[PDB]
From a paper:
The second advance was the generation of a cobalt-substituted stilbene-cleaving CCO from Neurospora crassa (CAO1) that was shown to be catalytically inert and allowed the crystallographic observation of well-resolved enzyme–substrate complexes. We previously showed that Co substitution in the stilbene-cleaving CAO1 results in undetectable catalytic activity as we have observed here for ACO. Although the previously reported crystal structure of Co-CAO1 did not show notable structural differences compared to that of Fe-CAO1, the resolution and data quality of the former structure was substantially inferior compared to the latter. To allow a more rigorous comparison, we collected data on a Co-CAO1 to a higher than previously achieved resolution, with significantly improved quality indicators. Similar to ACO, we found only minor structural differences in active site residues between Co-CAO1 and Fe-CAO1. Additionally, we observed subtle variability in the positioning of the coordinated solvent between the two metal-bound forms of the enzyme. By contrast, the cobalt ions in Co-CAO1 have B-factors that are comparable to the coordinating His Nε atoms indicating full cobalt occupancy at the metal-binding site. Our pre-edge analysis, therefore, supports a five-coordinate geometry for the cobalt site in both CAO1 and ACO.
Carotenoid cleavage oxygenases are an ancient family of enzymes that catalyze the oxidative scission of alkene substrates. The oxidative cleavage of alkene bonds by CCOs is accomplished through the use of a mononuclear non-heme iron center. Taken together with the preceding structural data on ACO, cobalt substitution appears to preserve active site structure in CCOs without supporting catalytic activity.
Residue numbers in the entry:
A (entry chain D), B (entry chain A): 30 to 526
The structure:
Amino acid sequence: LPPAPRYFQGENTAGFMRPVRFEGDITNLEVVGEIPKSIEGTFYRVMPEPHLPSFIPNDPWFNGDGNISGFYFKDGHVDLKQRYVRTEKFVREAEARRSLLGKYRNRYTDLVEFKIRSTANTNIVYWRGQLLALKEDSPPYAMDPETLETFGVYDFDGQLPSLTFTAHPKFDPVTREMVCFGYEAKGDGTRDICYYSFGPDGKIAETVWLVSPVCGMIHDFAVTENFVIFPIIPLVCDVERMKQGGDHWQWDYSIPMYIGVLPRRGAQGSDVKWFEAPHGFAGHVANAFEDDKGHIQLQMAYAKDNVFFWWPDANGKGPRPGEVEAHFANFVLDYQSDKLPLAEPTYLVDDDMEFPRIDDRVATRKHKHTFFCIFDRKPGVTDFEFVMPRAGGGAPMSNGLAHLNHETGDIQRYLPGPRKLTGECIFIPRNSEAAEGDGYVMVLLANYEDMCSELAVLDTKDLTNEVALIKLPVRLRPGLHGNWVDKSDVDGHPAPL
Amino acid sequence: LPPAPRYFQGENTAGFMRPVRFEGDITNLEVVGEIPKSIEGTFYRVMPEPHLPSFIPNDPWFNGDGNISGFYFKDGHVDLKQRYVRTEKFVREAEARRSLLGKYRNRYTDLVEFKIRSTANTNIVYWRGQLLALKEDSPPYAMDPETLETFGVYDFDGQLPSLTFTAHPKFDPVTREMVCFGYEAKGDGTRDICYYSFGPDGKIAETVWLVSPVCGMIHDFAVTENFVIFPIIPLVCDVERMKQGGDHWQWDYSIPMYIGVLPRRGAQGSDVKWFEAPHGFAGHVANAFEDDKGHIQLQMAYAKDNVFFWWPDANGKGPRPGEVEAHFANFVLDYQSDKLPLAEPTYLVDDDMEFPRIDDRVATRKHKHTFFCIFDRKPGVTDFEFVMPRAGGGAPMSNGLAHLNHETGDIQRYLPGPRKLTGECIFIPRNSEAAEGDGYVMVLLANYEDMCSELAVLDTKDLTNEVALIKLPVRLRPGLHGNWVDKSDVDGHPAPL
Ligand SMILES: [Co+2]
Ligand SMILES: [Co+2]
């Protein structure tokens, strides 16, 4: 067998990216300032964090075992619980004390045959009293919100129609449905997309099979009152390339950024219209909604070249690290139109941005507040000379948050400091009567000066000032998505505005 | 109530002394080099580690909640398990989310009435299938060796005759007895010493009540074939001073270092002889034995002034940090002699030393190998300019280990590096047939460059070279005592030579 290294090597696991790999508890976290006492609930986040050194050199960040953090808040006190998802991969490699799963999304490189290849490392959401640890090549793994015990692979009481479940389901605040899909839904390289939904009682509602024009990565999607929308990243999969040990994904410069639109209820697969946006990278969706005229406004991060540069085109062509910027774009779509090509989008701000969140009380409807990560290259915002030698590689960088008011056009920027970077933020309604976008924002910070993580709590009245700074004595390695579960919400999700 | 701080402040909790306060697991620790595959067992160590910020400013290191680390070794792999002892203090303060116990060994400063004030933070030993987490003001707390679950306060099946159980019991390798005592055995300020022992079946054997000439600190003791020996540190307790908010301990320059000698079996309290060594500090006992003539050779660390300088005399007189050196001393005692004063001891080496370990297969008998911590002030051994600003205060420093062969006089010195310091080492017999002092030494290192801990594994054939270096991604705060429990020893303790 390929030799199992006994310590981590490579820039993807150096400095702040070095795995810690701890599970357990740290109660009564140190706090500078004061956590508002009305805040009650839990911030769940997930990070990729390899449990064992890979036999694949320079294994991407995206292929690390999912480790779940929960920050439990009550009466101005906070406790951390931390636990790895018990995926098939995790369990078998723990039993063997060596890595066994190979390249990202390529089963032909595995040292043993896996039934499920999930690292469950992308998102962690709440649904009907469980957490669902998500990875877009697999079904969810269900977990206990209180103990972070893994129950196992979840198939929605045998109703799950797809091999795959997106990392970005949407929760309709009015209907209380979880709206979902999976791509490569019948296996590696398939162009089948399964769109499906579940009512608040747990019963499956929609199930519509459709066909993608290419086998392209559909990481995120959008849901409006009457439509679901599938933006396709021009990374394309060829199973025959995989069989020879090649990458699951390869950039294709010759195709548009397809944007499928399907009626949300009652459709067949042939009802989908594959609109054609100018070539570019589909980043995360902030939110989408239908305006007065019934046209879809789709607000998402959008770049002009391959953000995932480590998977270049057929001839190895693509950008370098830190070259590609994504911008906050508005696309206008009309399901009635037979004109397939779409205009260039309008841009809402000029910042290099990603990881947009809204007040999810208006998800699928008109929103007027968006919170997002920014990466500002303006001199002095980040002390790169200090940070980069300590940072390792493989993960995106964010050196602030921004709050956009879409009515007024005002932008507030939170800057944690020259030697700190951020993860994705969460938004917490002040209380059940609060206005849209009024409450608290939390975000995990990497402090390169201390080589420790911190959890910042901000008030939306003034996003520039930390109301509290929760000081962890360990590193939480840069991660992906996270969610707030408020104690006052019986089903885990906030009430419609 | 005195206000509870919400983050740690003061030099006793700064830099490397900052509490981490984590409980749980880190399996498959990173290893540089190679852990010998024949090593099988567990290294248990305890550190003081305040779970909540104290309301007492500059609370000594000795008053921190005991947190147990177990390093589980098999086939060249190692896992860490870590868990706090569930003392009454720990549980009640966790329930309240604030500190409640006050000054070291002064119940008159507590905010609530405690039955048991143990922090269980001094030593962690194996006895009859349990761990015993030890603190000299209290009975032991019993724990599960595998899970580190706390069972609770342990009273030896209702046989425990004393309110106090020493942190330094001795395990007789021939008789398989645990030989014990407690001072302040009937409560605060009492001069009662209870000497007691347990046979390998768990039945109490000896129980002898005796009287100390002063209420002085008896931290360690010594056991030979026919005697038990009690060296008294000239720190003295006055309950009336405590009732006014003062220190439990106060140095007394006017008294000798008393050394009590009692027959090991069948004695009464009046059989004790209080010999009078020159005034000084009784450090840790390496070992004691009877020579050919029946005279006790007592080998221990011994200093000429108050090592615990933060508890000075009645007029605040005492030394400064880093001033007092302890040296490896041999005292000769004769229970037959009626001459109470003793000569100055001979010194075995010149190093400033502490934390002596022997091959416990010859405990209570003649030993010819001793391993110990050293602190070398010679320029370049420790880069003080780098280390001290990162170190915090409150804890002793050691920048190497030494191995003394007592027959040949040879000394080997392990120096981890200019920016590393050590804790107390453990010795592991190579196998059940190994000669005295032949095998492996392990020691926990504080790496001030990475702000991480490391566990070094050394072969006694060459103590200067690390065979392996186990790299923890977190800090284990400087701690106190630790022990090896070999898998091949059914009762947890090695077989006699
Ligand atoms: Co995502
Ligand atoms: Co001790």
